[PDB]
């Protein structure tokens, strides 16, 4: 399950069906990846061809981003089971990661 968030408008999505923290067209989207995080109980369910999912480095070692759409990612720890400090982001990775 997820348990904890960086992003408020994340949480409020999750938490209240409240969409004024992202963009509109792309409530649904978020909706589909939120959902896939909190029913996951092992990080290879999301390893599908949509979610690009990766495991990030250095400053990052121990979280893993999902795809929304474009560049934006939804970023989390996954610890036995659960999700921690969910985040959102709209960039591409570089090379070091
Ligand atoms: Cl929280
Ligand atoms: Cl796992």
């Known amino acids: 399950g997820i348990?904890?968030?960086k992003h408020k408008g994340?949480?409020?999505?999750?938490?209240?069906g409240v969409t004024?923290?992202?963009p509109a067209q792309d409530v649904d989207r978020i909706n589909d990846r939120l959902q896939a995080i909190d029913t996951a109980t092992e990080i290879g369910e999301?390893?599908?061809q949509i979610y690009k999912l990766h495991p990030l480095?250095?400053?990052?070692?121990?979280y893993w981003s999902i795809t929304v759409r474009a560049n934006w990612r939804i970023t989390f720890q996954f610890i036995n089971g659960d999700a921690?400090?969910?985040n959102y982001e709209d960039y591409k990775?570089?090379?070091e990661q």
Do not use: H
């Open 3 to 5: 348990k904890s968030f």
């Open 10 to 16: 994340l949480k409020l999505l999750f938490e209240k």
């Open 20 to 22: 004024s923290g992202v």
């Open 46 to 48: 999301l390893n599908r």
């Open 57 to 62: 480095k250095g400053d990052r070692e121990g």
């Open 84 to 86: 921690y400090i969910l």
């Open 93 to 95: 990775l570089g090379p």
